[PDB]
Amino acid sequence: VKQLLNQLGHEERTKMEENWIEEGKRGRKPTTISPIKCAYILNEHLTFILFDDEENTKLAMYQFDEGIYTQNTTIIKRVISYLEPKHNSNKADEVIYHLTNMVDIKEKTNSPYLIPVKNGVFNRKTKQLESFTPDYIFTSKIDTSYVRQDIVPEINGWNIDRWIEEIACNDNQVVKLLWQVINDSMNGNYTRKKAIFFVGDGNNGKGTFQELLSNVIGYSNIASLKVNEFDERFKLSVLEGKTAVIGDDVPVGVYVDDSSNFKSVVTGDPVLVEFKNKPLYRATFKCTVIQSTNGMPKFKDKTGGTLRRLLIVPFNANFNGIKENFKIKEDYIKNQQVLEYVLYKAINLDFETFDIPDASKKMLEVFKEDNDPVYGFKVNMFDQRKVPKYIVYAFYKEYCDENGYNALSSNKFYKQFEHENYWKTDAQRRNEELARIYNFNDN
Amino acid sequence: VKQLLNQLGHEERTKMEENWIEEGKRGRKPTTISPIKCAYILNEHLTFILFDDEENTKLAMYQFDEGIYTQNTTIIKRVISYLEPKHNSNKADEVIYHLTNMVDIKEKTNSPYLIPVKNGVFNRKTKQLESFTPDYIFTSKIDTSYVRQDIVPEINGWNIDRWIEEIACNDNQVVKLLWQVINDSMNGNYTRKKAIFFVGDGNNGKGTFQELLSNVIGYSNIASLKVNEFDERFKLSVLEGKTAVIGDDVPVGVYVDDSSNFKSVVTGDPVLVEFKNKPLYRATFKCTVIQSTNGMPKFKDKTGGTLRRLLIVPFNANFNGIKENFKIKEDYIKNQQVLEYVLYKAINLDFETFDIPDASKKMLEVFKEDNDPVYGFKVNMFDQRKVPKYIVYAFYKEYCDENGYNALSSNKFYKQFEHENYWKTDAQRRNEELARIYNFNDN
Numbered sequence: 001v002k003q004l005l006n007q008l009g010h011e012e013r014t015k016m017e018e019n020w021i022e023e024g025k026r027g028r029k030p031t032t033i034s035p036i037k038c039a040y041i042l043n044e045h046l047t048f049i050l051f052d053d054e055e056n057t058k059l060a061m062y063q064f065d066e067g068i069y070t071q072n073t074t075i076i077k078r079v080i081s082y083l084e085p086k087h088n089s090n091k092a093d094e095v096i097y098h099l100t101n102m103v104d105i106k107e108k109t110n111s112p113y114l115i116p117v118k119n120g121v122f123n124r125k126t127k128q129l130e131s132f133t134p135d136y137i138f139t140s141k142i143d144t145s146y147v148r149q150d151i152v153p154e155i156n157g158w159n160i161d162r163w164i165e166e167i168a169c170n171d172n173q174v175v176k177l178l179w180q181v182i183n184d185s186m187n188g189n190y191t192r193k194k195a196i197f198f199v200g201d202g203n204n205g206k207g208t209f210q211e212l213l214s215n216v217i218g219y220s221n222i223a224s225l226k227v228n229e230f231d232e233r234f235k236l237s238v239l240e241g242k243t244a245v246i247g248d249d250v251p252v253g254v255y256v257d258d259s260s261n262f263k264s265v266v267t268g269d270p271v272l273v274e275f276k277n278k279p280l281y282r283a284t285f286k287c288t289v290i291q292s293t294n295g296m297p298k299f300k301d302k303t304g305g306t307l308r309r310l311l312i313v314p315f316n317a318n319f320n321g322i323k324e325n326f327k328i329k330e331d332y333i334k335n336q337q338v339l340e341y342v343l344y345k346a347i348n349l350d351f352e353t354f355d356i357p358d359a360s361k362k363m364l365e366v367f368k369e370d371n372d373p374v375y376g377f378k379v380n381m382f383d384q385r386k387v388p389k390y391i392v393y394a395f396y397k398e399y400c401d402e403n404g405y406n407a408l409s410s411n412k413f414y415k416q417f418e419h420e421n422y423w424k425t426d427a428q429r430r431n432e433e434l435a436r437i438y439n440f441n442d443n
Numbered sequence: 444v445k446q447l448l449n450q451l452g453h454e455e456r457t458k459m460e461e462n463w464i465e466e467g468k469r470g471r472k473p474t475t476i477s478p479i480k481c482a483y484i485l486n487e488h489l490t491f492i493l494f495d496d497e498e499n500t501k502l503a504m505y506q507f508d509e510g511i512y513t514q515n516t517t518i519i520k521r522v523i524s525y526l527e528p529k530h531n532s533n534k535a536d537e538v539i540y541h542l543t544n545m546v547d548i549k550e551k552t553n554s555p556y557l558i559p560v561k562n563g564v565f566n567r568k569t570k571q572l573e574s575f576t577p578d579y580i581f582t583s584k585i586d587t588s589y590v591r592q593d594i595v596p597e598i599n600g601w602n603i604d605r606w607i608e609e610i611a612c613n614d615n616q617v618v619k620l621l622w623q624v625i626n627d628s629m630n631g632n633y634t635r636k637k638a639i640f641f642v643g644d645g646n647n648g649k650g651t652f653q654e655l656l657s658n659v660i661g662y663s664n665i666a667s668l669k670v671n672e673f674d675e676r677f678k679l680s681v682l683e684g685k686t687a688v689i690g691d692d693v694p695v696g697v698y699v700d701d702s703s704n705f706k707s708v709v710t711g712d713p714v715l716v717e718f719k720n721k722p723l724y725r726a727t728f729k730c731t732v733i734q735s736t737n738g739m740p741k742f743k744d745k746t747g748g749t750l751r752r753l754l755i756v757p758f759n760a761n762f763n764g765i766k767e768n769f770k771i772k773e774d775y776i777k778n779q780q781v782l783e784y785v786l787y788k789a790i791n792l793d794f795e796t797f798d799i800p801d802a803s804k805k806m807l808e809v810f811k812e813d814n815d816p817v818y819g820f821k822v823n824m825f826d827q828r829k830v831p832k833y834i835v836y837a838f839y840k841e842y843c844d845e846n847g848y849n850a851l852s853s854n855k856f857y858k859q860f861e862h863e864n865y866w867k868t869d870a871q872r873r874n875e876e877l878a879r880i881y882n883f884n885d886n
């Protein structure tokens with residue numbers, strides 16, 4: 001590209017001089033290509049597009065070697081210097097401005113079936129790799145190269161697939177889910193309407209797995225934001241061009257006062273996002289949610305909407321008793337051969353809905369008991385009754401022995417919402433005892 | 444208009460060159476049309492207007508293909524480049540300033556009887572489609588095309604009307620209300636002084652209906668604001684150019700402290716709005732309010748205005764039990780034929796006041812009982828008594844089993860304000876018992 005523009009610039013400069021020689025020394029000497037002329041040359045011999053007609057849209061250039069469109073002005077301005085090095089920043093801006101008016105408007109290819117990779121675009125419908133073309137409008141791509149892998153790479157006798165088995169404590173469902181998680185992470189146009197949480201007390205490898213995703217996927221392609229930080233001002237601004245969002249560390253049992261922004265991103269509904277000192281606008285994020293926490297956080301919603309969105313990974317394995325291998329976190333996951341195999345296996349994996357492991361379901365039920373004290377009381381009933389409201393209330397087994405405040409007769413309406421027998425009214429059965437109380441089961 | 448402007452610019456440049464030849468080589472050579480001449484040519488051969496005479500008003504250009512006036516400076520500057528490509532940003536701004544000085548001032552057509560649609564304007568008085576003309580000043584239009592529909596479109600054997608029936612659990616009143624809600628949503632100049640709230644326990648399809656509305660209407664034409672976010676600073680600024688506002692998710696039972704701006708927007712009264720780092724100004728919003736919540740929120744007003752402004756949609760249907768059809772939310776509602784049929788049926792529907800379903804009336808009454816403890820106690824009275832204030836008080840049936848703080852006698856004044864028998868004072872009937880108390884009904 002640089003060699004092409006350098007030849008074009010010299011040819012155009014020579015042509016201008018020849019015309020000036022033909023007209024004689026009228027004034028000074030034309031040695032600098034005019035900014036409008038530069039736009040004419042660049043548009044002809046390069047691919048400049050405009051993403052949309054909205055005001056102050058930045059010009060996008062298709063850099064041939066990378067195969068993706070870029071809006072970086074410095075990259076574009078460097079290209080201007082190849083054609084006309086004598087242009088300063090103001091004149092280069094004039095060249096950019098002229099190109100903005102000239103170029104046609106094309107929208108970014110947001111097809112979920114296409115995933116850009118360093119080697120080229122990957123079409124999930126055909127499960128085939130396609131070479132970079134200007135027709136595919138992409139602004140970012142996965143850093144790792146896509147090559148066909150037949151044998152699992154081994155570095156110092158360490159197997160990446162066995163490491164995944166070690167992380168999941170040799171659980172077939174979890175390792176299947178973990179591969180599905182990596183598959184969903186790379187695709188930035190399909191969200192699958194699920195949120196992934198990593199729960200580990202300590203040294204469970206959550207950070208290494210996050211660093212693995214940060215390595216197989218581009219470093220710039222990932223976002224760092226916690227669950228409680230989604231609703232803060234300007235925090236959603238970072239998720240503009242991110243394929244996925246990773247929560248490096250979530251506070252233990254943090255109270256998510258408002259999960260509306262979190263729930264919208266997980267489902268994929270449009271959310272209100274504002275850049276700092278910039279006007280508020282509306283956009284849709286399809287990136288998946290990855291969060292690492294040392295314990296399931298508490299959500300104020302206590303509704304079915306939050307429950308369906310959440311997915312939990314057990315991470316039962318501990319690396320404290322076993323000797324810590326800093327080589328895994330620092331070197332092994334950064335190996336190119338290891339990364340390429342992970343990319344090849346994950347992107348080739350095809351699935352429609354997240355295959356929920358039984359361990360996640362059991363641990364998800366634990367969170368439901370923790371989140372809703374009423375549901376925990378229903379689970380912990382273990383009783384063979386409906387007519388006496390005070391008996392079935394029983395102060396909810398003394399706060400269900402959890403020290404969580406419970407309303408009076410309001411959660412009772414919420415209780416029957418949770419649950420065949422429903423409500424039966426009998427005057428005989430329905431204040432024998434105030435009930436603190438050790439009568440776990442009556443007659 | 445690109446061809447016309449190119450020809451005009453070439454002709455003007457040729458005329459200037461001929462004039463310079465007539466005057467000889469006085470100095471250099473005139474090849475760039477002066478900005479004032481460009482403004483003259485554009486005003487002669489295009490339609491530029493100014494919405495109002497207030498300071499720093501942006502010039503509006505009638506783009507012929509779209510049929511609506513636009514204030515986007517990039518489009519106008521692209522038009523300038525079509526006329527004279529060699530102007531940079533500064534000279535384009537000079538042309539825009541000259542045009543602003545030249546053009547006349549016309550106000551936007553805010554007639555509620557006219558609804559701009561992609562094909563053309565729709566007159567509700569005549570219920571007829573009219574082609575685009577510069578006479579109608581519109582800044583935005585409905586994205587979907589208006590075509591006459593005779594048969595309900597079917598994609599993969601899925602019927603949109605049957606989907607609406609399924610959403611409303613085969614309730615004629617609720618589906619009629621939904622069609623009326625869509626009809627109100629399309630019109631951005633008539634507010635009808637009602638607020639629509641979607642309540643759903645689980646997967647009730649509220650998000651799918653919101654996406655359907657955002658698809659039939661223009662994506663840029665909808666605002667994303669929740670109720671509790673109405674009074675947050677700079678949040679109303681987005682509402683200026685939106686036909687309707689939709690809250691994607693509302694926290695379950697969120698305590699909306701201040702509802703003044705929300706009530707004003709629902710009624711349509713003028714409200715004070717401020718953009719970030721921009722002067723405060725008073726503006727009138729006629730957009731309709733649609734909100735999705737997993738439970739009816741609470742308002743501190745306990746006033747008739749909040750009750751009369753609010754309208755609730757049951758959404759009793761649940762898609763958690765029936766297998767979820769992701770194609771409904773992802774693909775089927777994005778079908779052009781389905782969107783066109785929905786547009787036609789909704790815009791052709793004619794009604795004056797929101798036909799409130801009986802289910803909404805019962806659910807609205809349940810919200811009224813929840814909002815005011817005194818009203819709920821009065822409903823739960825079921826008693827055959829007026830003279831003893833403490834007896835009829837009964838601590839409001841001991842908080843009415845809803846742990847709501849109640850005034851000792853101010854709420855009594857509020858009760859007698861709400862409610863034939865009124866008050867009768869008798870010394871005989873009026874401290875037998877302190878009254879906690881199980882005497883539900885006395886003699």
Ligand SMILES: Nc1ncnc2c1ncn2[C@@H]1O[C@H](COP(=O)(O)OP(=O)(O)NP(=O)(O)O)[C@@H](O)[C@H]1O
Pocket residue numbers: 163166200201202203204205206207208209248249292319322323324325326327328329330
């Ligand atoms: N298979 C393995 N065997 C032994 N040590 C390992 C293995 N995989 C990773 N490690 C080490 O275990 C540590 C994992 O750190 P990390 O994942 O951050 O712990 P964590 O507390 O669970 N995550 P975080 O809460 O963000 O700190 C690193 O020192 C790794 O080098």
Ligand SMILES: Nc1ncnc2c1ncn2[C@@H]1O[C@H](COP(=O)(O)OP(=O)(O)NP(=O)(O)O)[C@@H](O)[C@H]1O
Pocket residue numbers: 267269305606609643645646647648649650651652691692735737762765766767768769770771772773
């Ligand atoms: N008729 C239908 N039959 C089955 N599934 C449906 C039907 N209509 C929609 N769905 C699916 O049901 C889901 C609707 O999601 P959504 O409307 O967001 O649930 P919601 O909780 O009520 N709204 P929200 O609170 O914002 O999440 C999507 O997965 C749709 O594909």
